[PDB]
Amino acid sequence: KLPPGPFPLPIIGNLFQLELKNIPKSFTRLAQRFGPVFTLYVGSQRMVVMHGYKAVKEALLDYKDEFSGRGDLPAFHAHRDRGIIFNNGPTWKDIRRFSLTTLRNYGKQGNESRIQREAHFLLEALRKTQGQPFDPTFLIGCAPCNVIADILFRKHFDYNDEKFLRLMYLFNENFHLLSTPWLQLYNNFPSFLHYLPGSHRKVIKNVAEVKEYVSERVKEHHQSLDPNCPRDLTDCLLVEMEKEKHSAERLYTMDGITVTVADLFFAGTETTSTTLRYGLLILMKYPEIEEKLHEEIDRVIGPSRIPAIKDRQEMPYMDAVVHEIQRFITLVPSNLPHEATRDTIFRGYLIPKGTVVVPTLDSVLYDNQEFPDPEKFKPEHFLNENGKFKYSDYFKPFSTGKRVCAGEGLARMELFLLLCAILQHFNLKPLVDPKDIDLSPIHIGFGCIPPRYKLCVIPRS
Numbered sequence: 001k002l003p004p005g006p007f008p009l010p011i012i013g014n015l016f017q018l019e020l021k022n023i024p025k026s027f028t029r030l031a032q033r034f035g036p037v038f039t040l041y042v043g044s045q046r047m048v049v050m051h052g053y054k055a056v057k058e059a060l061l062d063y064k065d066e067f068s069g070r071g072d073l074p075a076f077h078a079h080r081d082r083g084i085i086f087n088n089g090p091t092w093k094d095i096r097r098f099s100l101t102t103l104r105n106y107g108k109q110g111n112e113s114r115i116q117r118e119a120h121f122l123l124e125a126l127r128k129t130q131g132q133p134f135d136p137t138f139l140i141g142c143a144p145c146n147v148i149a150d151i152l153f154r155k156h157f158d159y160n161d162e163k164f165l166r167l168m169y170l171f172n173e174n175f176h177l178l179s180t181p182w183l184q185l186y187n188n189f190p191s192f193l194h195y196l197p198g199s200h201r202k203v204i205k206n207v208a209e210v211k212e213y214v215s216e217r218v219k220e221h222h223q224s225l226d227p228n229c230p231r232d233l234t235d236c237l238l239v240e241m242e243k244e245k246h247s248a249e250r251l252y253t254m255d256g257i258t259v260t261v262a263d264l265f266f267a268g269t270e271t272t273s274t275t276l277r278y279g280l281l282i283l284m285k286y287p288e289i290e291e292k293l294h295e296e297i298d299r300v301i302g303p304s305r306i307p308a309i310k311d312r313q314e315m316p317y318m319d320a321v322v323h324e325i326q327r328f329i330t331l332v333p334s335n336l337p338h339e340a341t342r343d344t345i346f347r348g349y350l351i352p353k354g355t356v357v358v359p360t361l362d363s364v365l366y367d368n369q370e371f372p373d374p375e376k377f378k379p380e381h382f383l384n385e386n387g388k389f390k391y392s393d394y395f396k397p398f399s400t401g402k403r404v405c406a407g408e409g410l411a412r413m414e415l416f417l418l419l420c421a422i423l424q425h426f427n428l429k430p431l432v433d434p435k436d437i438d439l440s441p442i443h444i445g446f447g448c449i450p451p452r453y454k455l456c457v458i459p460r461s
Ligand code: HEM
Pocket: 070, 084, 085, 086, 087, 096, 148, 263, 264, 267, 268, 269, 271, 272, 275, 331, 332, 335, 336, 337, 397, 398, 399, 400, 402, 403, 404, 405, 406, 407, 408, 410, 411
């Protein structure tokens, strides 16, 4: 006995129910017609979609083990059932718990200091543009890139090095491309379409170039490994592997490790970068907000002292903007796809093993009761009428549960420390009138991709 759904047609199924440029808006339409749990078939891959905090909460927390699987994402058949993001096999639980442990120890003062170092290079690069117009995409991006780099490869990159930029280029191209209608079709009809021309070929060339670059980095680390002396997360995984040779039941291969690593790298980068990039664009739209932030920075931190995590509890306005940048932009709006590990019962309904379960996040992030006027950027969505920070259980842009984002703590510290560093030293100057900025995502699918723009940064000191 399944959840309500539209009458699915042969082979295509429910395709017609969805606008491919805007799946999330199409899920919300379905939420009115059929309620907070509904059944879609696309391909003949059956999926269950939950809408609204109540229904999204339950699915993620109440039925933890049941929905802890990873729905199939064919663009990433080079990552599939290895690593962490894209993996549905029995190899998942142990790689995830171990990578989590490792991050937390590299992370505690290590993350604050690491991020803090990186901001010196970031600011230098922003100064360097000598107040003239620049696309921030591959400037602001280098900062979260380096941070995940040093954790992963103890490697640090200059801002103009060829390969660095090429990695960032691929990260960005795949994200744009994975948010286009053409890719959405690819994702549910992979065997009809895979071998045809079109930009799934590009997204796949690119997944491979990234895996190849990482591959080489993991072999480099083999060949000069001091087992006594990890230098980065790569070594720790190599080390977990060597402790595991005398065992026919293998839970790490060179392959296993290169994927864990690629996952962390591209997620460690593209994710923070998009957020930051969409944050600056928002703040050029609302000059009054950017200015309230300058006053609070100058009052609590002053012209020059480096920003720290301890400054957060003391800046309730920044805290609400960093929260609202994330809330408003709904970076991953349909979440990452879950799947039923087991046949299960949800509220009243049957969900078979192998059903893709979509616990949609923008429906939570955009609750009309939690956040009146959810369509508007409004810092006071996280402030009592009293100027103090207002916590929300509805702030789930990292999801929650057995598969909660592995990079949460890092990302959150990044958006804060970095936004702070940026605005302390510069003001934003756009090249169009604040009134004229479209803040709407240009591509909506896998992520929400912001308009491409240029700006100027004007030194404060
Ligand atoms: C900056 C904003 C970020 C957002 C909004 C975000 C969001 C998400 C979301 C929504 C998921 C899906 C959770 C689920 O399966 O239910 C996810 C998974 C994941 N994220 Fe992130 N992320 C961000 C940054 C990062 C960073 C910085 C890293 C790593 C350094 C990271 C690493 C991962 C990994 C490895 C998974 C797969 C988890 C698993 O299946 O066990 N993310 N992320």
